[PDB]
């Protein structure tokens, strides 16, 4: 497995010109996928987590931005982490990104957590860059190993029975948490239905209940959907990711939902900060921001 050596090499580029690659061996990467997969399967698909915790949204292969997040948030295991998915695609360093994340999951399996995003799906990461990066840097067989691993990622987390976390958002079909718990893994993400919505849906201030999503997949939901969901489930907050937001975090339905996004100046096409939300032992939530310099 060689884990500490793998982590050392991944972290060696701290202080290098951003964009510099870390090229692990194919066998090393395979080993990460295989062990992390075992771990994901041994833990619930709907995680039950306790504060203190730091929550991050999309990274999209922006490896040197991920390194900064750990530098300011505290490297595992000094802080506990929950990531909300979308580790791969768009960025040029999906491989370094996902390998470091999987390494820390393997090293600290009770204190480090990764959810599945819509890009942790073969039909999506085939097209938006992760397959290309695997093909160029390794081979297509390694991309298939990643798919097997991704297909076992948990889908949602509940923090101290009060914060519901998933990549996308709610589903018109979601009535009981048991509907999430009963999803068997490995699984692909379908084109429609509960699992799709959890990874794909968006809040929208201009829709009342449920509307159509401009992505051509899943739905949008309004502030009233959020209020009823939280009331039904005795929850305080939905934490999700999935949309670029200018300051890295953005509330919806008052403070009832928050969107987190952790890829600063997203794929060099947006001017946005990244952010993380810290939840302390007493459940005090705060935001720390990652802003590109001018």
């Amino acid at each position: 497995l060689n884990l500490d050596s793998i982590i050392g090499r991944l972290l060696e580029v701290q202080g290098s010109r951003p964009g510099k690659n870390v090229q692990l061996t194919e066998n090393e990467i395979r080993g990460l996928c295989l062990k992390s997969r075992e771990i994901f399967l041994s833990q619930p698909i709907l995680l039950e987590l306790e504060a203190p915790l730091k929550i991050c949204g999309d990274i999209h292969g922006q490896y040197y931005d991920l390194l900064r997040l750990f530098e300011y948030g505290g490297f595992p295991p000094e802080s506990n982490y929950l990531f909300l998915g979308d580790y791969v695609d768009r960025g040029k360093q999906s491989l370094e990104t996902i390998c470091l994340l999987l390494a820390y999951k393997i090293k600290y399996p009770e204190n480090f957590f990764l959810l599945r995003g819509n890009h942790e799906c073969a039909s999506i990461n085939r097209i938006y860059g992760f397959y290309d990066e695997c093909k160029r840097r390794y081979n297509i067989k390694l991309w298939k190993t990643f798919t097997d691993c991704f297909n076992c990622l948990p889908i949602a987390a509940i923090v101290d029975e009060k914060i519901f976390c998933c990549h996308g958002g709610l589903s018109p079909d979601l009535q009981s948490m048991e509907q999430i718990r009963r999803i068997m893994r490995p699984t692909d993400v379908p084109d429609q239905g509960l699992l799709c919505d959890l990874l794909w849906s968006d809040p929208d201030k201009d829709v009342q209940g449920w509307g159509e999503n401009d992505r051509g997949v899943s739905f949008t939901f309004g502030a009233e959907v959020v209020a009823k969901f939280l009331h039904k489930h005795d929850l305080d907050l939905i934490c999700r990711a999935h949309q670029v937001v200018e300051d890295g975090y953005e509330f919806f339905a008052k403070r009832q939902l928050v969107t987190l996004f952790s890829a600063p100046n997203y794929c060099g096409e947006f001017d946005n900060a990244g952010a993380m939300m810290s939840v302390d032992e007493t459940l005090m939530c705060s935001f720390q921001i990652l802003k590109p310099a001018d």
Binding site: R68, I127, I140, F287, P292
Partner: protein, 157 residues
């Protein structure tokens, strides 16, 4: 690691905190840490091509429904004794992303004498190079550059 942060206006005071809410939101200033400028860290990616990726993918899905087998052919002065055609998916298949298929098997040639390769077989890999979702010219160039005992993966229904 860079550890200096600035502070900005934090979250405003909430006017109506729901009655039995357990979580709290800090009003303290928000800490703002720095990461690289776009000049220092080019976060752009120009190589993402979703239309090319999709055509390749469809061909890969077809190949996975095939029976795959290895063939080794000793290349001689008369070449491999096959001719190839590229075929893609649908009427508007380009020239860019094709499957590569055996058009002819030359009598007395290496492919023929070996016995295994037949007309309409797909050539999936040659000497560890994938021929699934390539140009007919990429494929012809690869096969012409092959030498000695040439390794194929061949696909058949």
């Amino acid at each position: 690691p860079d550890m200096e942060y600035s502070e900005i206006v934090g979250l405003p005071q909430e006017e109506e905190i729901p009655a039995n809410r357990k979580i709290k939101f800090s009003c303290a200033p928000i800490k703002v840490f720095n990461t690289y400028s776009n000049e220092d860290y080019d976060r752009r990616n120009d190589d993402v091509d979703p239309v090319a990726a999709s055509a390749e993918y469809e061909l890969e899905k077809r190949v996975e429904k095939l029976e795959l087998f290895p063939v080794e052919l000793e290349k001689d002065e008369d070449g491999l004794g096959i001719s190839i055609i590229g075929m893609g998916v649908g009427a508007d298949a380009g020239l860019e992303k094709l499957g590569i298929f055996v058009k002819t098997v030359t009598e007395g040639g290496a492919a023929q004498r070996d016995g295994r390769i037949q007309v309409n077989d797909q050539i999936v890999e040659v000497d560890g190079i994938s021929l699934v979702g390539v140009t007919q010219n990429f494929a012809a160039t690869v096969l012409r550059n092959t030498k000695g005992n040439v390794r194929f993966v061949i696909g058949r229904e």
